[PDB]
């Protein structure tokens, strides 16, 4: 089966150019299908950007048409998107997708996983504070305080610790800044001897911290 995978920078400066590439595997760019980009701002609906045929013929959303370039590269089996003069309205998850196009109708039959691209203007790096943790179970965590914009990712022990992890939705404070907490529930018995590290990454401000959480 054909698979699609987006790649490219997740952060763009205002007025800069968003650049993404879709690697097609399992099948050829050359085919009866058209190739396309669709985006979805967080919490909003789907918006089609445009489509390209393997020969290079393009067709774009007329509300974007002045800023969009879609290209195909059969030697690498890829098709690409450039979106110029970006603003905050371009922050979105970008999907590549395969279209089935007949003489009178079309639809989408295959989608990439989607990649978030954020247009970063103002930004603020968070502080990361440990939330230190008897019998029973124990809660410990990390507070990621006062960052902008979203998002932050949190993992624990480099992704090795998954069970019992709950990273809470961020709060938007009256300050206009975000905070969030990530908590893991562990056996009280593992505390004396298991090391717990929360891996925080706020890419808009290049804040990448691995914070040890100790009693």
């Amino acid at each position: 089966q054909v698979q699609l995978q987006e790649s490219g920078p997740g952060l763009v400066k205002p007025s800069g150019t968003l650049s993404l590439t879709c690697t097609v595997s399992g099948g050829f760019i050359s085919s009866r299908n058209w190739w396309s980009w669709v985006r979805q701002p967080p919490g909003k609906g789907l918006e089609w950007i445009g489509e390209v045929y393997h020969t290079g013929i393009t067709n774009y959303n007329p509300s974007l048409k002045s800023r969009v370039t879609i290209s195909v590269d059969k030697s690498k089996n890829q098709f690409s998107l450039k979106l110029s003069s970006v603003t905050a309205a371009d922050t979105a998850v970008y999907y590549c997708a395969r279209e089935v196009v007949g003489p009178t109708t079309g639809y989408f039959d295959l989608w990439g996983r989607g990649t978030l691209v954020t247009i970063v203007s103002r930004r603020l790096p968070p502080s990361v504070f440990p939330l230190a943790p008897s019998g029973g179970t124990a809660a410990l965590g990390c507070l990621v305080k006062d960052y902008f914009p979203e998002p932050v990712t949190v993992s624990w022990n480099s992704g090795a610790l998954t069970s019992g992890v709950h990273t809470f939705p961020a709060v938007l404070q009256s300050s206009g800044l975000y905070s969030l907490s990530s908590v893991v529930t562990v056996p009280s018995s593992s505390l004396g001897t298991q090391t717990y590290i929360c891996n925080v990454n706020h890419k808009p401000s290049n804040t990448k911290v691995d914070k040890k959480v100790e009693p």
Binding site: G45, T104, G106, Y107, R113, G114, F129, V171, Q173, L180
Partner: protein, 209 residues
């Protein structure tokens, strides 16, 4: 333009109907996608009425001229998702999408919240700041009230609380943050987070080390 309702809610086992209306549907047909959080859309109904082979039999589609309908019989909790209808414009130049319909599945069992309360970290206090963090999880329905106390007196200023949000296991989570000066923190004997849910309260207390 395609028009679909922003929300539909159904009880488990009932039949959900989501309509999509637009003048292009007769010639350009309608296609339905299901989309769950952090996932790409998935085609569930092709060309008005066709069900793709991997899609459960309870999904079906119908057409009624300038309306098309997605019907889910015997709705399950797993069907809660956004649903998009899609067509094309009258000149067959571009796709059109509806705004999406959130399907909510009602009738989950009530569940009382768990509450964890953390004091300020030593690192924060050294930065001349103090935050108490009250984390509230695994409750249903998705309404809670949080009250903070300094000793036993109510604290109102410096409070930030999220609106409850649905977790992966279909129960809700919320969090509440109390900002203090380190002088406030050390002066009182303790602070407490009181979480009220459907008339029952759970309280947690913390104190300076």
């Amino acid at each position: 333009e395609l028009t679909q309702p922003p929300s539909v809610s159904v009880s488990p086992g009932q039949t959900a109907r989501i309509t999509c209306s637009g003048d292009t549907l007769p010639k350009r047909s309608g296609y339905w996608y299901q989309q769950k959080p952090d996932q790409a859309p998935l085609l569930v109904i092709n060309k008005d009425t066709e069900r793709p082979s991997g899609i459960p039999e309870r999904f079906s589609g119908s057409k009624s001229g300038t309306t098309v309908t997605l019907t889910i019989s015997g709705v399950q909790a797993e069907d809660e998702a956004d649903y998009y209808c899609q067509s094309a414009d009258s000149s067959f130049t571009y796709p059109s999408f509806g705004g999406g319909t959130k399907l909510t599945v009602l009738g989950q069992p009530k569940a009382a919240p768990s509450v964890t309360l953390f004091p300020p970290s030593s690192e924060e206090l050294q930065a001349n700041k103090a935050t108490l963090v009250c984390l509230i999880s695994d409750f249903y329905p998705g309404a809670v009230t949080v009250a903070w106390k300094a000793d036993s007196s109510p604290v109102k200023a410096g409070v930030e609380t999220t609106t409850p949000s649905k977790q992966s296991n279909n129960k809700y989570a919320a969090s509440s943050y109390l900002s203090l000066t380190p002088e406030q923190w050390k002066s009182h004997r303790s602070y407490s987070c009181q979480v009220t849910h459907e008339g029952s309260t759970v309280e947690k207390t913390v104190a300076p080390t």
